[PDB]
Design a protein around this ligand. Structure first.
Ligand SMILES: *[C@@H]1O[C@H](CO)[C@@H](O[C@@H]2O[C@H](CO)[C@@H](O[C@@H]3O[C@H](CO)[C@@H](O)[C@H](O)[C@@H]3O)[C@H](O)[C@H]2NC(C)=O)[C@H](O)[C@H]1NC(C)=O
Ligand SMILES: *[C@@H]1O[C@H](CO)[C@@H](O[C@@H]2O[C@H](CO)[C@@H](O[C@@H]3O[C@H](CO)[C@@H](O)[C@H](O)[C@@H]3O)[C@H](O)[C@H]2NC(C)=O)[C@H](O)[C@H]1NC(C)=O
Ligand SMILES: *[C@@H]1O[C@H](CO)[C@@H](O)[C@H](O)[C@H]1NC(C)=O
Ligand SMILES: *[C@@H]1O[C@H](CO)[C@@H](O)[C@H](O)[C@H]1NC(C)=O
Ligand SMILES: *[C@@H]1O[C@H](CO)[C@@H](O)[C@H](O)[C@H]1NC(C)=O
Ligand SMILES: [Ca+2]
Lengths: 194, 420, 437, 437, 433
């Protein structure tokens, strides 16, 4: 069930098992993910939704992140609690695992990874945070993909016509007033003394 | 020894601590209701087994079965001990449990959205003047017009000679007719004035006094309008429990058959029997699922929800967009359970009283109920006036125009008929 | 056997059934606590006799002997089995006695007279300007009018040629009479403007200076009125003890040695700490040794006089001029004292919870607090602005009308005597001639 | 003998000498502490060799073994006995190390984007009424004027006998043209009056309604403008920590765990406790990790960024828009670390006291802070109200005058080419005739 | 064994207890410094007898025989011990006795009276609009009137043949003369207007634009004056040492034989030499005997004063008339006295640092320098206006009358000389008739 997930950014889908390997929830389930950034780029992992509700103890259900290849050499962090910190993948190879144990009703594991933390800044790339020039197309792509707001963040006469119906009633009154003016000119030029 | 306390996952009472590394043992839980228990252990001497209940359920029996699913079971079957958690001291439980003395009181109160500064805009005018004066100014204008006319007729100096170059004529000119006096009266109210200025020092006194009265009126109206638009304080439509009854426009509600309905049922004060009659009338949406959806539907529309006082004192501190209109209606007491006949009662009530009258309880309550507080809804009065604030004048103008057309055609036919 | 029930005498709690003939037994005593006792005795089915406590006080531990007093003492030594009185629940008392669950709660809230129903001002036309300015303006109006007249009499560009037929305007007057100049000055002052419009520079400069003076005066007046009204509107009445903390113009109050001052000194919360410091600094400057004298001190000055909530409810219902502000600073209940060991406490607790579930004790409370509560409904303090009482007097208009009528009739008499040359002769003819129009 | 001193690279304190040709040893450093050590050497006669800690950190207690690193580590050991660099004097750093008197004073203080300016739009005079009523007002003026004109041209009352002494002639007409009615309406809207006197019922009633409209519009405009000015004038910009604490919109912050936020962590004071509560409520929404990132955050947003005083001075005097707000929340001293058993501690305390007595180190403050401490004070920004930068658009007058002269010359040509029926015939005659008179 | 603590009687540091009779014993000095001493004793473990010094002194050097009158004198004799009290950390004192790490820091600061706002006459009424717009408006009025006059000549129809009742003669005559054009302008600025309103079209646009300008100006003026008259943010003239270092309306101060000038003399520094030169000039009203005299003098005159950074805080937090302005100038230290080589030096410095890191010292400072606090200076902007605030318009009016009279007699003699010779007798008859 090890599914590759590599590029510049992406979302590890919340409980992506129904289509890759549709496993029965009765048996314990687990699927690992491998991440590769662009050449010469490290990874930043930021959870967007995470709730392992069925316990605050971890012999059954949890999510873990390992650095480098998918080996036991050095666990970056296994997260077993309400909240989940962001993490820095020193290497360029990602490891994401979730262990479930007849607890498939777990809310989700859902995160987002951003590449190019290592890349030195250049005119082509964008600075958001300290050693975080990440731009290949990432500038304001609709996702909060930098450590705190900075990158995708607040980069970006007809108003008076766009009224709900004040403009409509105003222009109806304007037609009335044009009728009035055109009528007025008639007796501007028509009548005289007596 | 060790004691099996029992709590529940209420919102600001006992909630899982927020951390990242795993928590082990009795350090997972966190809240006011369990640090109360910590103080109790410090003053008495305990040993903690904070074990939750089977299924989240305040102990409430089933009449047919005769079982007591909830904390009542673990307080009866001795599989637990004192169950420090919000547990209303009600009559039916008291037979088969023992409750300590309450450590805080309760009651059911209203919940409503505070008003926001959007004036009706129909007539946002005549506000900075009582309508009494608005009527008096018109009737005084009529009175001064009439008296000015009367003074004008009974005067020697109010008669001009038309054709003044010809001194052989009559003196019929008076510059004051049945309508001219009224016209000048109204025209001096608004700071332009007609061209019918008096000539006799007997009526120019009236002119001057009328000028003074209108100057004061206008220069005070402007001041009052500026005062209202500068320091504006909006007030609630309803401000009492009784006001909800005999109103029949707010369409309040309550939780479906929870604890509020239990009170309103059988409540024979009859000040809330009208309340219950209206609730049971529209028993499709006024009685709603739970507290979250209740406050949701309150946020949606005018909906005076009705629930326990402490959860109000909590949720109105986070979402400072609502208000606790009214005071108190009833009183319950959250207590500390204990098995029937256990000696903990008399050894724990004394500790509760010690904490209560030693002053730590109020700080304990405030440390959890506080929240952010009251934000800066105080310096906010920077907005341009719009049609939502000035709309009546255009309506008055249209009415004046149509009345002008009507009276114009009427007078035209009047004169033509009189000639014919 | 029967039950020997002790009791205390208190204003709204236990009273004497007001009677003339001598009655005795458990019938002299009548009150809310008596209602509760009768109800719970009917519920629990007992027979009772009533005895007042002789020493006549709640009771406290006398340190010199470590021995109880009053109610607590007469209860501890099994002389009496029950005590249906507002016996407060507290640490020192609970350690020796046994109570039920409280049949009511209370607090320590703030007495305060409602602010005299939004005190109105009358004859406030001229409030924003001190009277000296008004007198100066009147005198300056007179002076500039007469000066305008004087230069309007001695200068070349005065005489007006009415017809365009090169005539000689040898008339004594052309455009300025004393009344006309005076009332042009007044009209220019009053923002309406008149027709006596100057031509010569000599009068033009006077007119310009006068107009500038009028704009300064009127704009100053309007701004001052807006300032007064916004200052009045901005201030807010006190509605919490925290306002009593920050604000210090009004004064607190307390019955020291009544454990309220003791509550404040023993407290550690910021606002109560600073108010306790305030009373300590004042040290009988604002302090009270009873209730009624404190009530009167509130009735005579901006006095807070913090009191327990129940008596505050009673007072603010008997009277209608002083009402509580804020909520409940502190909480503490009441009870029904029973000895250290009594199989009556469990059933009395069951009964109190029963009555509370039916809410009957609320009915007795409203019968005795609200029962005397609202037979003297005064008003609702109608809240509005721009009312006729404040800056809405029309009496100056009436004075103008009166003086106009008098002046009109006076100069009509002048037109009669000095221009028809006969008294009581031109009267009837003149008024008949001029009445038809 | 020769002594050894160990320092740190810092922003204003100990910089490496800026040059292109190589520089060496004691002659390759510059800044504050180098000058201070130079004066200490001149006042005590040392032989100092300067060097850095390979770790290059303040040095702090490490919980892995209870050991230390950096200056503290090498100073408990013996590689040097002096450290002339900002090294906060704290309990953990005082238990083992020996410190001299503080030669400078520190403190955590907030930093804030100063009020940038008024940011005035010259059309701010047009602000109090929304840009929807104005077109309503203009179109209503057109409509009311045209209705007045059309009524005045059809009425059995309006037509008037012209002659001043009229013996029943037959030359009657009205006086209302399009221009007359239009400018009557404009004047009434403008409150300066007009020339026409409405006579019939219809014209007078429409005039009265129009007057009522104009009066309330003008009064509401003045009221709203006064509202803006008197609600802006009573705004209170933040000037202290507690006043900041009451405020909510401006998010807080600090460099996390840099011994600054920890002060809020372990504090006991109520105001700082609620500060820390807000800190924890936001919790990496606003808690910056590095100084310069927070600096840019405050530049581009509203923020506080509580950080130590000296760096705030070094930044504010090296930039603009940033204002030192408030005072000194805490108190630390910058000593000169020494080992326990050493004679130089007392000698150096005497030396630096002598330095501080003369104000010499205040002059070092001037040199490394103030010499570049007023290169960016553009002005002192004399504050007041009622300037031409707000509501001072005279360009309206310019447009009016140019349009008026354009239409004037256009109609001047019109009356010659068309009304005189021939062009160029009477140009020069017209100018001469209307010029020489 | 107990300690031999010494203490000087400084007011907001040590105090004789409020009550007297049931309080007899040499353990009844209390105050902030006493709180520090007691907490120090608890955290260290010892007892102290608080013996007052025989001669009231911080301590001071005496040149004649090295005498050190004050607690310093006996503090080298070892007759006493740790002496918590105000005691500077100056160079000369450190030479003979040891010190500790200061428990607070202070300097010299400016003491001055709070602004009051008895605002002047003439300036006050036209204050709202800044003097720029006033002259802009006068010039604009002159220019608008002049251009109206210019366009009047070019106007086609203003030529209106007076009395057109007889068209007999084409007497084409004028209106909108330059004099009356300026009159129309100046009477249009003020909200009354003449009767010479435009009777043509091209001039009517100028009239309308002028009317709009007048309305905008008057409404804005009223709004801004009603703004100033309900907020009234008073402003202080001096706000820094260099600020009053160059003015002369405000006078400096000092304390007789006070350390303030001792530092402030031989300043050698950029700006402070100037004010020492000034007080050197008038050394008769600058100095006062002690701090209390300076307080009284600043309460009397417009008298800027120069005491320390703490006593200013103590005085200004109990008498809400003064105000601490500027900031710090110098830095000194308050520590604890002790003889050389005593074991208590580091043992007390560690405790003081511990307390200062715990925040205890801040709580003691706040509680012993709190006072009632600054009162509510808010609910008082209800002031009926008086001549004190608008009076200048009356002077303007008087100037108008006098200039009017002078111009009237001038134009009278102008007409007279248009008629007859310089010597006047007939015009006397004209005046009499
Ligand atoms: C407080 O400010 C908000 C901001 O606009 C306003 O609340 C508004 O309240 C009204 C009802 O009081 C909402 O009207 C709508 O009515 C329809 C009727 O079917 C219903 O479907 C909607 O769900 C809603 O109830 C209006 O939407 C709501 N505004 C917003 C933005 O939700 C109002 O100005 C202030 N509140 C009050 C009670 O005046
Ligand atoms: C604000 O109000 C205070 C309180 O009245 C004003 O203080 C007054 O200041 C003047 C100096 O401008 C003092 O004048 C002095 O008077 C004494 C005797 O009265 C005389 O011996 C001195 O030579 C000097 O002339 C005046 O005494 C003082 N008021 C009091 C009650 O002492 C203050 O001027 C007002 N304005 C400001 C801006 O502070
Ligand atoms: C209300 O009346 C009482 C006495 O009748 C008086 O003492 C009090 O001052 C009045 N209220 C106010 C606000 O003046
Ligand atoms: C308040 O009203 C009550 C009776 O209505 C009475 O005490 C008195 O008239 C008032 N007391 C005041 C104003 O102090
Ligand atoms: C106003 O403040 C903003 C802060 O983002 C700044 O960019 C801008 O330059 C300022 N404007 C002026 C006129 O100072
Ligand atoms: Ca006018």
């Amino acid at each position: 069930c090890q599914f590759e997930l590599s590029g510049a950014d992406g979302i590890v889908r919340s409980s992506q098992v129904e289509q890759e390997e549709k496993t029965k929830p009765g048996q314990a389930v687990d699927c690992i993910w491998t991440i590769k950034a662009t050449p010469k780029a490290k990874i930043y992992l930021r959870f967007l939704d995470y709730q392992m509700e069925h316990s605050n103890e971890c012999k059954r259900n949890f999510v873990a992140v390992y650095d480098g290849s998918s080996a036991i050499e050095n666990l970056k962090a296994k997260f077993c609690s309400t909240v989940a910190n962001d993490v820095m993948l020193k290497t360029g190879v990602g490891v994401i695992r979730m262990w479930a144990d007849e607890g498939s009703r777990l809310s989700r594991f859902r995160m987002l990874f951003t590449s190019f933390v290592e890349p030195p800044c250049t005119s082509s790339t964008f600075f958001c945070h300290s050693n975080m020039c990440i731009n290949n197309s990432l500038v304001c792509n609709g996702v909060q993909n930098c450590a705190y707001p900075w990158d995708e963040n607040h980069c970006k006469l007809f108003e008076q016509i766009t009224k709900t119906h004040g403009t409509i009633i105003g222009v109806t009154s304007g037609i009335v007033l044009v009728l009035l003016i055109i009528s007025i000119l008639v007796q501007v030029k028509q009548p005289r003394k007596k | 020894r060790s004691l099996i306390v029992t709590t529940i996952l209420e919102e600001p009472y006992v909630l899982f601590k927020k951390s990242d590394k795993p928590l082990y043992g009795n350090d997972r839980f966190e809240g006011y209701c369990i640090d109360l228990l910590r103080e109790l252990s410090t003053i008495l001497g305990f040993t903690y087994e904070i074990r939750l209940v089977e299924d989240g359920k305040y102990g409430a029996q089933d009449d047919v079965n005769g079982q007591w699913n909830g904390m009542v079971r673990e307080l009866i079957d001795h599989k637990a001990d004192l169950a420090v958690a919000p547990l209303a001291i009600t009559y039916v439980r008291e037979k088969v449990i023992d409750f300590s003395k309450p450590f805080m009181t309760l009651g059911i109160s209203i919940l409503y959205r505070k008003p926001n500064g959007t004036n009706p805009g129909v007539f946002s005018f005549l506000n900075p003047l009582s309508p009494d004066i608005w009527m008096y100014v018109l009737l005084a204008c009529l009175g001064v017009s009439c008296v000015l006319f009367v003074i004008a007729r009974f005067s020697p100096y109010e008669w001009y000679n038309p054709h003044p170059c010809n001194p052989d004529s009559d003196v019929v000119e008076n510059n004051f007719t049945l309508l001219n006096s009224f016209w000048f009266g109204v025209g001096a109210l608004m700071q332009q004035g007609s061209e019918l200025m008096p000539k006799a020092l007997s009526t120019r006194i009236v002119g001057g006094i009328w000028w003074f009265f209108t100057l004061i009126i206008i220069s005070s109206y402007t001041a009052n309008l500026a005062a209202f638009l500068t320091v504006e304080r909006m007030e609630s439509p309803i401000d009492s429990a009784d006001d909800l009854a005999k109103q029949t426009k707010i369409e309040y509600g309550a939780v479906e058959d929870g604890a509020t309905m239990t009170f309103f049922k059988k409540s024979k004060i009859s000040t809330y029997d009208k309340m219950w009659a209206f609730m049971s009338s529209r028993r499709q949406s006024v009685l709603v699922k739970s507290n979250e959806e209740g406050i949701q539907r309150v946020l949606t529309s005018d909906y005076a929800f009705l629930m326990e006082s402490t959860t109000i004192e909590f949720v109105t501190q986070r979402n400072c967009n609502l208000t606790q209109i009214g005071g108190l209606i009833d009183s319950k007491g959250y207590g500390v359970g204990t098995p029937m006949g256990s000696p903990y009662r008399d050894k724990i009530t004394i500790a509760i009283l010690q904490l209560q009258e030693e002053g730590k309880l109020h700080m304990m309550k405030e440390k959890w109920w506080r929240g952010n507080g009251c934000p800066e809804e105080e310096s906010k009065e920077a907005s341009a006036l719009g049609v939502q604030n000035i709309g009546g004048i255009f309506i008055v103008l249209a009415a004046g125009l149509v009345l002008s057309v009507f009276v114009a055609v009427g007078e035209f036919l009047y004169k033509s008929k009189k000639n014919a």
